[PDB]
Ligand SMILES: [Ca+2]
Ligand SMILES: [Ca+2]
């Protein structure tokens with residue numbers, strides 16, 4: 303059978319302290335080897351213990367707590383509590399608790415009637431040490447009015463799944479995954495939180511974020527970040543679907559992360575850029591709908607940039623690398639900058655800036671007047687003796703609108719390809735146009751740019767900026 307807290311003396315009347323009865327039900331379920339602790343409809347008042355790590359209710363291995371539904375079963379911190387409480391429901395610190403979860407209930411932090419930092423649901427083994435909770439589940443759970451963190455799974459947790467859950471009106475973050483491994487957040491809503499809707503931090507890796515919605519938060523709707531500690535970066539973070547809109551900061555912020563992907567999401571109405579990527583080694587930005595961002599100021603809907611933490615906790619400089627930005631609808635300017643490696647960068651209807659950096663890159667501007675910047679002669683070249691092509695190709699250059707920014711390369715204009723000029727040439731097929739420097743460097747490399755189509759007769763000098771003054775007069779972007 304199931305274990306009913308009201309059979310253990312829980313009143314569920316909104317005043318009596320039901321902590322002991324709920325914990326007795328949990329302990330009885332544990333003694334039998336596992337089970338379900340069921341709470342009928344009602345408001346159950348709970349309190350904490352002697353220490354912060356005691357939380358309020360200590361859930362245990364093989365024990366699931368199952369209420370009557372969000373707003374129907376409410377576990378609410380007692381009025382006047384003035385003690386920091388790390389997890390109204392939590393597992394034990396120093397124990398690798400496993401195969402437990404919470405279903406069909408509301409956790410209420412009673413922040414209006416209590417003092418101190420309170421978190422709703424807390425998991426993990428020990429900060430900074432090895433060992434993990436595993437097989438943790440939260441389904442159809444609402445966490446509200448906690449002072450710091452609504453859902454705060456922590457270090458370490460393996461195979462956590464939070465689904466169909468809501469976190470709202472919490473102090474800092476509705477959902478925060480700290481060192482989650484092989485974990486899934488799906489079909490959740492995080493809104494009206496103090497700082498973040500969703501926060502993936504502290505070396506979390508192999509995380510799926512599917513069809514989540516974040517709005518009304520004081521900062522990012524979703525942030526994937528290393529954190530404030532000198533620790534390993536998160537990696538393998540796959541965001542699919544969902545919406546991140548009307549937040550006080552960027553819709554989606556990804557910084558100091560490896561192999562992150564954001565696909566199929568709707569990102570609009572945010573105060574900062576819709577998508578901001580800072581020092582990410584491996585970033586896929588695919589088939590998103592990004593519009594009407596930067597509502598509190600800013601010039602870009604999408605920002606790709608590095609992160610200089612040389613004066614920070616790590617002392618390192620992190621370059622954004624290995625970017626594939628394709629298929630997005632972006633109703634504004636996109637700053638698509640990358641570095642060494644092959645990058646595929648596609649703009650949208652806005653006035654975009656594209657620079658793939660070193661390596662062989664494929665650039666396309668889409669609609670609007672787009673600037674394609676080439677900042678170094680080593681960033682696009684062909685070696686004829688080796689018959690090796692490392693030539694950036696521009697897919698859809700439009701001479702009447704787009705601009706090639708070569709202002710820092712020391713070329714003076716079009717010509718025969720020697721002595722500071724670039725030769726405008728057509729391939730023998732008529733399908734490709736080339737801007738070629740016919741002078742080889744010491745390594746036998748020729749600086750070249752490939753443009754798909756036949757542009758020998760329409761591409762002119764005013765389409766290329768050869769120095770700083772020409773860039774000043776011809777610039778197509780505010781970036
Ligand atoms: Ca239920
Ligand atoms: Ca534990």
Ligand SMILES: [Ca+2]
Pocket residue numbers: 649650651652653654667668669670671672
């Ligand atoms: Ca464009």
Ligand SMILES: [Ca+2]
Pocket residue numbers: 640641642643644645658659660661662663
């Ligand atoms: Ca590149």
Ligand SMILES: [Ca+2]
Pocket residue numbers: 667668669670671672700703704
């Ligand atoms: Ca264009």
Ligand SMILES: [Ca+2]
Pocket residue numbers: 679680743744745747
């Ligand atoms: Ca060279």
Ligand SMILES: [Ca+2]
Pocket residue numbers: 658659660661662663681682694
């Ligand atoms: Ca390049």
